[PDB]
Every structure is written in C-alpha cells, then in structure tokens.
Ligand binder design. Structure first.
Ligand SMILES: Nc1ncnc2c1ncn2[C@@H]1O[C@H](COP(=O)(O)OP(=O)(O)OP(=O)(O)O)[C@@H](O)[C@H]1O
Lengths: 83, 78
C-alpha cells in the first residue's frame, strides 16, 4: 500500500580494531537465507583482459536468476565486501 | 621541479582458444564415426575379396570341364 523502496547498501567505518568484521559476520549468522557471499577485495583482479568484470558479475548472477524465477516473493541475498 | 616519471604494468591477451571447444568436440565425434565406418568397410571388402577368390576356382573348373567334354564328343563323333 505504501509502495516504498528498500535500502540496498551499508558502509561501516572506524579506527582499527572495533568490531567491524565481527559485527558483519554476526549479522550474516543472524539472517536465514542463502549463505552470504564474501569477497576479500584484492582477489577480483586478474591478469587476463576482461576477467575482472566476469568475476564481479558472477556475484549478482545468482541473485538475478532467483529474482527472475520467483519474482517479488524471492529471498534476500547478502554480499560482503571486505577492504 | 615538476619532472615526473612512471612505471609500467602488463596484461596478457587471452590465449588462442574459446572457439576450440565447440567445433572441436563435434569434429572429434565425426572423426570417430568415420573411423568406425572405415573399419566396417575394411571388413566387408575383405569378405568380398575372399568370395571372389572362391568364385575363381569354380569358374576355371567349369571352363576346363566343358572344353574337355566338347573335345571328347567331337573326337568320338568323327
Ligand atoms: N565490541 C567488542 N566486543 C568484543 N570483542 C571485540 C569488540 N570489538 C573488537 N573485539 C575483538 O577484537 C578482535 C578483532 O576485532 P575485529 O576483527 O572486528 O577488528 P576490525 O574492526 O575488523 O579491525 P581492522 O580494522 O583491522 O579490520 C576480536 O578478537 C574481537 O573479539
């Protein structure tokens, strides 16, 4: 009835050693859904031309497929970008 | 003193393939089928050669028999 759009991103920051990674993993444990996908940052870059974009799109491929399959009654997919 | 210098990084273009895995598999399957057909043709050709060799002897024997019979009949007739 209200028809509002949800939020789709969060940015945590602060000095070193304050619980960011612990908080993120605990949030991942809290949610009941597909096992959250974790990226370590420098692991996407590849020497072959064009493979970085393929690696990036492999993250959203499954979410797009599920949204197409089920529609508005699909689950929530969580992605974590460390560093 | 605005004299800058740089360093370079390299990237490797993808090696020659990603078109050698769709026509390739079909090529291999067709080659296998052709090999099987060739083996079958080998077997059939050998059998046919054996049969022709078998026919030859009967051919020669009938020729000899008819010639001898004709000569004998002519000799007795006169
Ligand atoms: N609020 C907290 N309660 C309990 N333990 C904490 C808390 N904050 C940090 N710690 C402890 O600090 C350690 C490292 O914390 P964490 O891995 O979250 O650091 P970080 O914020 O990721 O740091 P960095 O900036 O290096 O990534 C863990 O052993 C964790 O138990």
């Amino acid at each position: 009835q209200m028809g509002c759009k949800h939020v789709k991103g969060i940015l945590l920051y602060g000095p070193p050693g304050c619980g960011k990674t612990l908080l993120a993993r605990q949030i991942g444990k809290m949610l009941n859904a597909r096992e959250p996908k974790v990226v370590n940052g420098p692991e996407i870059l590849n020497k072959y031309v064009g493979e970085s974009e393929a690696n990036i799109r492999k993250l959203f491929a499954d979410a797009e497929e599920e949204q197409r399959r089920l529609g508005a009654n699909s689950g929530l997919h969580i992605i974590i970008f460390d560093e | 003193d605005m004299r800058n210098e740089l360093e370079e990084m390299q990237r490797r273009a993808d090696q020659l393939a990603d078109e050698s895995l769709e026509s390739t598999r079909r090529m291999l399957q067709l080659v296998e089928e052709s090999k099987d057909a060739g083996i079958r043709t080998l077997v059939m050709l050998d059998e046919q050669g054996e049969q022709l060799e078998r026919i030859e002897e009967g051919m020669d024997q009938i020729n000899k028999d008819m010639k001898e019979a004709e000569k004998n009949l002519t000799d007795l007739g006169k």
